Amino acid sequence: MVVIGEKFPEVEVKTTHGVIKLPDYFTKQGKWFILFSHPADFTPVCTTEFYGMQKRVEEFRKLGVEPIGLSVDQVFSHIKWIEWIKDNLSVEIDFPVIADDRGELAEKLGMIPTARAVFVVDDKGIIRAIVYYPAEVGRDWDEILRLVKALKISTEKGVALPHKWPNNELIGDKVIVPPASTIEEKKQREEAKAKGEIECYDWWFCYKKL
Amino acid sequence: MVVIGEKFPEVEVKTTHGVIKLPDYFTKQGKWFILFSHPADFTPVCTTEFYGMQKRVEEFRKLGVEPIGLSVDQVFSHIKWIEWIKDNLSVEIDFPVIADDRGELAEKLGMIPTARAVFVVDDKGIIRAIVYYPAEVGRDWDEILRLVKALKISTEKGVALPHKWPNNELIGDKVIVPPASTIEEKKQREEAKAKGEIECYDWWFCYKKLE
Amino acid sequence: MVVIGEKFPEVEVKTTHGVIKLPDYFTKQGKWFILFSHPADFTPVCTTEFYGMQKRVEEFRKLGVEPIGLSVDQVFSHIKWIEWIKDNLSVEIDFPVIADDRGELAEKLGMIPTARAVFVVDDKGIIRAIVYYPAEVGRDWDEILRLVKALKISTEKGVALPHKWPNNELIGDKVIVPPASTIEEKKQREEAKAKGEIECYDWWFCYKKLE
Amino acid sequence: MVVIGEKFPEVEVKTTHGVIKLPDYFTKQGKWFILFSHPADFTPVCTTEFYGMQKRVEEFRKLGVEPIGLSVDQVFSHIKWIEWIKDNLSVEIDFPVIADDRGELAEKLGMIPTARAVFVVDDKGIIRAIVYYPAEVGRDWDEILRLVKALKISTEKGVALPHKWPNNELIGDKVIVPPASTIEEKKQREEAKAKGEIECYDWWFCYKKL
Amino acid sequence: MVVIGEKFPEVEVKTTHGVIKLPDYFTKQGKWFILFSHPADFTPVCTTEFYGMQKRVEEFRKLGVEPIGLSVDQVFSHIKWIEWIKDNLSVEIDFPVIADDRGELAEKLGMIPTARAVFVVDDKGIIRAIVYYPAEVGRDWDEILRLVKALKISTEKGVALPHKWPNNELIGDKVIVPPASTIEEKKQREEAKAKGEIECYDWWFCYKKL
Amino acid sequence: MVVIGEKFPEVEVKTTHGVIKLPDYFTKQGKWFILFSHPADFTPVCTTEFYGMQKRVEEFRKLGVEPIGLSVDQVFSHIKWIEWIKDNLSVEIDFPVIADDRGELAEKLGMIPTARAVFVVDDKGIIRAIVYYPAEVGRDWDEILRLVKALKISTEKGVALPHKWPNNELIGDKVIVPPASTIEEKKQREEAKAKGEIECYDWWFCYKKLE
């Protein structure tokens, strides 16, 4: 069972796009990845999810984030199920899906306590966020997209993101300055606020434009 | 380290509402709870979260789901921080918040690898879903609301919920029939569909109005 | 790793026909079964095998022998693959197929060293014969049919069956008398032969019409 | 007990043709072998089998496959029993038979849990297929011949063989192209089928002339 | 649990003034420190104590003694509580307070058997005196100031200090000569007293002007 | 090594007043005691301490607190040293002093790391406070007096005492109400204050006249 902050394990996997080495194959191109699991091929909640995912894949890719699925079914069933989606829902799946032949990688990643697990892994191979939904309730990939957006910004810009960013109730798409943690940094906030460089509800709750 | 399906541990916690026994306090009244951790009192992402949560708390409660927060700080900072919320954002927080003294409970639950973890726990004390976000990124309580709406329904109606339900791209707010797992069940789907009882894209992908 | 003579293990399996208990499900009705593994759904040698098997299934059943397949894939691909068989080769598969989730049963039986293994299991739950072919080479169900025909007969009539029976080069469809193992039994063969009750090439090689 | 895919053990055996080292004696000449066991000399089912085998030995040999028997009886009884077959059934056995004096090699190969065991071993000493029939039911060496034919072709040509090849119900003596296992190989099949290089019922079920 | 005469452990701590290394940060400047613990932020007995301490901080500092607090609360609550003291009691706290996140350092120092513990640590990192008061009874920092005064003098001057120095009942602010411990030192006292260099009630109870 | 909250050990000690059992001797009469060690008889800081203590002993006793000294020296030096005190400072010491033969009791209590240790032990045999001063620096019995005054009051009235009580900089000799630890308790503080029952700087900082 892996944990947030941990390195993604070194593993070779078999996919509908060929054998790959994770995390290396993504991390060597400076890319993130979102590894999600799903219970089985030719199941109705999973099929709505692949549809949802394919509709968003290019937004993920434009951020440098590559989605990759995983299920305990062989690659032949994977490919026939992708074809049923093309011929019946008019969408061409083009992200890789792992055929985790005996649940090996799923076991190791604690995807079987296989539920609805999501792992966001950055370009250094570090697990940044983890979701475990049960088999009966489909995910919402808009929230996962929001999360990776935020993850990316907080890394690049040294900032934190408010509840429901970029549509926070109180500050919309403004970002949060990490709370002052010493008497000297409190003074710094107060000066920065006096120069209009930041806005604050208090010395510990400051924010600014993206 | 807890996992989905596992039973929430029996633990006494100190809260802004007093000492309570989890999960019993909630489970004895037939209630679910959403236990969520947050790093510290007097921090800005947490404050926006608390505001978000109080806006939705009555929607959670109408479903029989009680939110309960948790932080490693003592109850007097908890209550002073809540007051700050009232005085500056004029919103009155009225869900309990655990003062997790030395991170004892945070340790048992694996929220100190606290980061922003969420545990959805049903009326039988069973953990139904788990989210771990990092410190820098605030959660979206609308997703957690959506998740428990869906959990309540799948339990009560023996159905499954599509991606992004009740606004699925393909079927909107309809619910999904668990897929046929035998030849006989497949015959049954085809008969039901012929009688207008269900809609199907295939024998394994049938759905219907929630009603 | 199972061997000939050993009793089939007690195991619950999920199939395209539901959950069943092996060997009990078959043994309780006085039936034999032929358990055969195949590598994966949606593969071409397996498909030709499935077609072959469905052509012969009623011949197996007339003998009280039930075929049952097994693969490491979940039951929904099983059933979709069967449908593909119906739609493209217009043959309806109606023998159960086990969905062997993580290769648990495949592991216990040594079919993952799955390759193409066959287990012939009698009405007492005893493994009577075992074939292990590799992935690249499809089986010949006519040989397995011949094998169980011969097994049923040797059990029921206390006889042995010659090479390639019922089309043996030397004696065609006659059956073989177990060879004399004592001086007294040898005298008995010679007396029977003198009375036209058996034919012999020697005292240890006697045979007779199946009747 | 040996297993499919495993190396044949290094062993010296005593035969009606002299002492030999297996698998070496065959593998050094680039030959395969079919090692089969039988319960005893001067038994009726075994005698029908030796007859059947001798009738096919030259077909096996023309493929580079050498048959070798094994039983728990000394070589003197082996030789007298071969003579009874010549004088009574008019056939001259000329494949070696091992005199496995105390069931040693049979024990080691799991031929005694001695039943009716068949081992097909290739020119690299690798067990390619294994049959265990009980003492009461004679084998059919036509099926073993069919198997080695197929084994040989699939090695040489990189192909798979259909149920009952070379007389498959649907495609007769045509061979099967290994199923496409990636989105790129599926495309390749579809192109090859469009050029008449192969025939398919689907992108995963392709076949061609031998 | 530490003990009088023992070295203060090597530890990094997080404070309202930043991360520091104890005892080093004080001992490298040749300074002593008084480490005191308190149960919690925004509590009434602790707040009277911070007030008392701030009123005396400059007297401590003039001796080369730096006060440092410690409590099990994060630095954000520490800073807001210091601000409540400024806005409500008109006093600006300016000694560091440690945010001992999980009671780690408190555990190690036996501050949790967190009670009202005081540790006086000298410029060589040696614990010189230790007080454990329960949560319900506030300390008196005048007595701690008296103690460090005495500690400092006895080190510098090689002397001992009487009950309640510098206002002893019998000798006021005079210091005590360490009792003669041999027949030769007794003689020395008697001679020194005869020269008016010291005053004595007996050869073992001698004292002099500061 | 004893700690605050821990129960004083059962021990027989020889004293200038005879053999006694601690803590029982004091606890059976409902009394507290202040056990304090001192390095040696016939030493000058200790002598000033003894004088200090005898001046205050009757103030300790009026509260039901018995002082008791301890040194590693035998009872005959104890009594001769006390006599020296009477003859030269004309003060009669009348509290017991333990002769701690080989430092046995000093060892158990951690007063030999004796230095100048003080243990305040209540009427239930529980150590309520501990001071360890070094050899060179005499104690201030006025602080120990103040400490037990405060301890007695917090026990009896369920209150807390401010810095330097009964002469606190901010509230003098008023006592402090334990701070509200729940939302409901906070409401109760605000109601009490509105009724003039308590004074507050905030909801968590309320105090009142000792009466």
Query: Looking at the structure, do residues E91 and E15 belong to the same domain, yes or no?
Result: yes
- Which bin fits F158, alpha (ψ -120 to 50), beta or left (φ > 0)? left
Beta bridge mates, A202: A205
Q: Omega before D23 cis (within 30°)? A: yes
Query: Looking at the structure, do residues A131 and A157 belong to the same domain, yes or no?
Result: no
Cβ–Cβ gap B48/A171 under 8 Å: yes
User: What burial class does residue C97 get, using C-beta atoms within 10 Å of its C-beta: 0-12 exposed, 13-18 middle, 19+ buried?
Assistant: buried
Total of domains in chain C? 2
Closest CA to C87 of A84, A91, D198: A84
Chain A to chain E Cβ contacts (< 8 Å): 21
CA distance F122 to F130: 12
Letter for the amino acid at E142? D
Residues after which chain F has a gap (C–N > 2.5 Å): 113
Strand pairing class (A175-177; A205-208): antiparallel
Residues after which chain A has a gap (C–N > 2.5 Å): 113
Letter for the amino acid at C171? I
CA-to-CA separations, A157 to A5, A193, B135, E160, in angstroms, rounded: 19, 19, 15, 61
Q: Which residues contact F76 (CB under 8 A, 6 or more apart)?
A: none
- Residue B102 CA, chain-centre distance (Å), reads 25
Q: What is the CA radius of gyration of chain B?
A: 20
Q: By three-state DSSP, how is residue A97 classified?
A: strand
Q: Which of C13, C34, C46, C177 is catalytic?
A: C46
Nearest residue of C to residue B205, measured between CA atoms: C76
Q: Which residues contact D209 (CB under 8 A, 6 or more apart)?
A: D174, D175
Q: By three-state DSSP, how is residue A93 classified?
A: coil
CA distance A131 to B132: 6
Cβ–Cβ < 8 Å for B59, B95: no
Letter for the amino acid at C11? V
Burial C159-176 (b: 16+ CB within 10 A, else e): bbbbbbbbebebbeebbb
- Which bin fits C87, alpha (ψ -120 to 50), beta or left (φ > 0)? alpha
Q: E70 to chain B: which residues are within 8 Å by CB?
A: none
Cβ–Cβ < 8 Å for A36, A105: no
Closest CA to A9 of A135, A107, A125: A125
Strand pairing class (B127-133; A127-133): antiparallel
Query: Looking at the structure, do residues F29 and F109 belong to the same domain, yes or no?
Result: yes
Please measure the distance between the N-terminal and C-terminal CA atoms of chain E and give it in whole angstroms. 36
Beta bridge mates, B133: B116
Rounded to the nearest angstrom, the minimum Cα separation between C34 and chain B is 20
Structure tokens at B105: 């409970």
Task: Tally Cβ neighbours within 10 Å of residue D19.
Answer: 9
Q: Which residues contact F96 (CB under 8 A, 6 or more apart)?
A: F15, F16, F17, F20, F68, F69
Query: Looking at the structure, do residues F144 and F205 belong to the same domain, yes or no?
Result: yes
Closest CA to B19 of B118, B98, B82: B98
Letter for the amino acid at E53? M
Q: Do chains F and A touch (3 or more CB pairs under 8 A)?
A: no
CA distance F83 to C144: 116
Structure tokens at F40: 């040696």
CA distance C157 to C207: 13
Residue D71, domain CATH: 3.40.30.10
Structure tokens at D56: 């096919």
Rounded to the nearest angstrom, the minimum Cα separation between C27 and chain D is 20
Structure tokens at E91: 């006093």
CB-nearest partner of A4 from B45, B134, B165: B134
- Residues in C lying within 8 Å of A, measured between beta carbons: 40-43, 72-74, 76-77, 80-81, 84, 101-103
Q: B203 to chain C: which residues are within 8 Å by CB?
A: 79
Cβ–Cβ < 8 Å for E82, E46: no
Q: D163 to chain C: which residues are within 8 Å by CB?
A: 45, 48-49, 51-52, 138-141
Cβ–Cβ < 8 Å for E145, E67: no
Read off the DSSP letter of residue A156.
Answer: H
Count CA atoms closer than 13 A to C73's CA, side-chain side. 27
CA-to-CA separations, C172 to C150, C197, F196, in angstroms, rounded: 13, 18, 118
User: What burial class does residue C188 get, using C-beta atoms within 10 Å of its C-beta: 0-12 exposed, 13-18 middle, 19+ buried?
Assistant: middle
Residues after which chain D has a gap (C–N > 2.5 Å): 113
Burial E63-72 (b: 16+ CB within 10 A, else e): ebbbbbbbbb
The Cα angle at residue C122 between residues C119 and C124, in degrees rounded to 5: 130
Residue C209 backbone dihedrals phi, psi, to 5 degrees: -65, 140
Percent of chain C as helix, strand, coil, to the nearest 5: 35, 25, 40
- What H or E segment, with its residue span, contains residue E153? helix E141-157
Domain holding F144, by residue range, is 140-211
Q: Which residues contact B177 (CB under 8 A, 6 or more apart)?
A: A44, B159, B160, B189, B198, B206, B207, B208
Got the DSSP string for chain B?
---TTSBPPPEEEEETTEEEEETHHHHTTT-EEEEEE-S-TT-HHHHHHHHHHHHHHHHHHHTTEEEEEEESS-HHHHHHHHHHHHHHH-----S-EEE-TTSHHHHHTTS----EEEEEE-TTSBEEEEEEE-TTB---HHHHHHHHHHHHHHHHHT-BB-TTTTSBTTTBT-EEPPPP-SHHHHHHHHHHHHTTS-EEEETTEEEE---
User: Taking each helix axis from N to C terminus, what angle separates B44-62 and B141-157, rounded to the nearest 10 degrees?
Assistant: 30
Rounded to the nearest angstrom, the minimum Cα separation between D9 and chain A is 30
Q: A140 to chain B: which residues are within 8 Å by CB?
A: 143, 146, 163-164
Q: B163 to chain A: which residues are within 8 Å by CB?
A: 45, 48-49, 51-52, 138-141
Query: Looking at the structure, do residues B135 and B146 belong to the same domain, yes or no?
Result: no
Strand pairing class (C205-208; D11-15): unpaired
Query: Looking at the structure, do residues C96 and C151 belong to the same domain, yes or no?
Result: no
Cβ–Cβ gap A43/C72 under 8 Å: no
Burial D58-94 (b: 16+ CB within 10 A, else e): eebeeebbbbbbbbbbebeebeebbebbeeebeeebe
Query: Looking at the structure, do residues F16 and F67 belong to the same domain, yes or no?
Result: yes
Query: Looking at the structure, do residues C123 and C34 belong to the same domain, yes or no?
Result: yes
Read off the DSSP letter of residue F43.
Answer: -
Cβ–Cβ gap B18/F179 under 8 Å: no
Cβ–Cβ < 8 Å for E170, E164: no
Laid out side by side, the sheet with B205-208 consists of B175-176, B205-208, B199-202
Cβ–Cβ < 8 Å for D120, D150: no
Closest CA to A196 of A181, A207, A180: A207
CA-to-CA separations, D45 to C204, D38, D52, D58, D140, in angstroms, rounded: 10, 9, 11, 22, 11
- Which bin fits D100, alpha (ψ -120 to 50), beta or left (φ > 0)? beta
To what resolution in angstroms was this structure determined? 2.1
F touches which chains (3+ CB pairs under 8 A)?
Answer: B, E
Letter for the amino acid at E199? E
Cβ–Cβ gap B16/F180 under 8 Å: no
User: Taking each helix axis from N to C terminus, what angle separates A75-89 and C75-89, rounded to the nearest 10 degrees?
Assistant: 70
Closest CA to A101 of A142, A120, A73: A73
Of the residues A42, A46, A87, the best mutation for testing chain C's interface (the one with the most C CB atoms within 10 Å of its CB) is A42
Closest CA to C46 of C119, C112, C137: C137
Closest CA to E78 of B73, A104, B44, B132: B73
Letter for the amino acid at A26? F
Q: Which of A13, A46, A99, A159 is catalytic?
A: A46
Q: Do chains E and D touch (3 or more CB pairs under 8 A)?
A: no
Structure tokens at F139: 């104690």
- What H or E segment, with its residue span, contains residue F148? helix F141-157
CA distance A199 to A195: 10
Cβ–Cβ gap A181/E75 under 8 Å: yes
Closest CA to D40 of D94, D126, D112: D112
Q: C140 to chain D: which residues are within 8 Å by CB?
A: 143, 146, 163-164
Closest CA to D132 of C118, C124, C49: C118
Nearest residue of C to residue A104, measured between CA atoms: C102
Cβ–Cβ < 8 Å for D164, C141: yes
- Residue B99 CA, chain-centre distance (Å), reads 20
Domain boundary among A139, A163, A182: A139
CA distance A52 to D185: 26
CA distance F162 to F176: 7
Q: Name the residue with tokens 């919309």.
A: A172
Rounded to the nearest angstrom, the minimum Cα separation between B7 and chain C is 25
Structure determination technique employed:
X-ray
Got the DSSP string for chain D?
---TTPBPPPEEEEETTEEEEETHHHHTTT-EEEEEE-S-SS-HHHHHHHHHHHHHHHHHHHTTEEEEEEESS-HHHHHHHHHHHHHHH-----S-EEE-TTSHHHHHTTS----EEEEEE-TTSBEEEEEEE-TTB---HHHHHHHHHHHHHHHHHS-BB-TTTTSBTTTBT-EEEPPP-SHHHHHHHHHHHHTTS-EEEETTEEEE--
Cβ–Cβ gap C79/B184 under 8 Å: no
CA distance B47 to B40: 10
D touches which chains (3+ CB pairs under 8 A)?
Answer: A, C
CA distance D122 to D111: 19
Structure tokens at D138: 């004679």
CA distance E78 to B74: 12
Read off the DSSP letter of residue E56.
Answer: H
Rounded to the nearest angstrom, the minimum Cα separation between E46 and chain A is 20
Cβ–Cβ gap D204/A15 under 8 Å: no
- Residue F147 CA, chain-centre distance (Å), reads 6
Cβ–Cβ < 8 Å for F130, E132: yes
Letter for the amino acid at C105? L
Domain boundary among C110, C139, C168: C139
CB-nearest partner of C40 from A72, A76, A102: A76
Residue C175, domain CATH: 3.30.1020.10
Got the DSSP string for E77-140?
HHHHHHHHHHHHH-----S-EEE-TTSHHHHHTTS----EEEEEE-TTSBEEEEEEE-TTB---
Q: By three-state DSSP, how is residue C163 classified?
A: coil
Q: Which of D46, D65, D70, D175 is catalytic?
A: D46
List of E strands, C72-174: 97-99, 116-121, 127-133
Strand pairing class (E11-15; E18-22): antiparallel
CA distance B31 to B37: 19
Q: E75 to chain A: which residues are within 8 Å by CB?
A: 181-182
Rounded to the nearest angstrom, the minimum Cα separation between D137 and chain C is 5
Structure tokens at B18: 């007093």
Q: Omega before C166 cis (within 30°)? A: yes
Query: How many distinct helices (H) and strands (E) make up chain A?
Result: 6, 10
CB-nearest partner of D4 from C84, C113, C147: C113
Query: Looking at the structure, do residues E24 and E117 belong to the same domain, yes or no?
Result: yes
Q: Name the residue with tokens 């992908």.
A: B205
Of the residues C75, C85, C92, C94, the best mutation for testing chain B's interface (the one with the most B CB atoms within 10 Å of its CB) is C75
Cβ–Cβ gap F204/B79 under 8 Å: yes
Letter for the amino acid at E188? Q
CA distance B143 to B162: 14
What does chain E come to in residues? 210
Closest CA to F122 of A84, D202, E137, C56: E137
Cβ–Cβ < 8 Å for D8, D39: no
Query: Looking at the structure, do residues B52 and B135 belong to the same domain, yes or no?
Result: yes
CA distance D175 to D157: 10
Q: Which of F46, F97, F121, F148 is catalytic?
A: F46
Cβ–Cβ gap B183/C75 under 8 Å: no
Catalytic: B206?
Answer: no
Query: Looking at the structure, do residues D5 and D34 belong to the same domain, yes or no?
Result: yes
B116 annotated to bind ligand: yes
What does chain B come to in residues? 211
Q: By three-state DSSP, how is residue A85 classified?
A: helix
CB-nearest partner of A18 from D179, D182, D186: D182
CA distance F138 to F135: 7
Four-CA torsion C160, C164, C166, C171, nearest 10 degrees:
-80
Q: F180 to chain B: which residues are within 8 Å by CB?
A: 79
Cβ–Cβ gap F160/E133 under 8 Å: no
Query: Looking at the structure, do residues A112 and A144 belong to the same domain, yes or no?
Result: no
Beta bridge mates, C202: C205
Domain boundary among B108, B139, B170: B139
Q: By three-state DSSP, how is residue F80 classified?
A: helix
Cβ–Cβ < 8 Å for F57, F49: no
Q: What is the CA radius of gyration of chain C?
A: 20
CB-nearest partner of F151 from E45, E137, E176: E137
Residue B89 backbone dihedrals phi, psi, to 5 degrees: -130, 0
Q: What is the CA radius of gyration of chain F?
A: 20
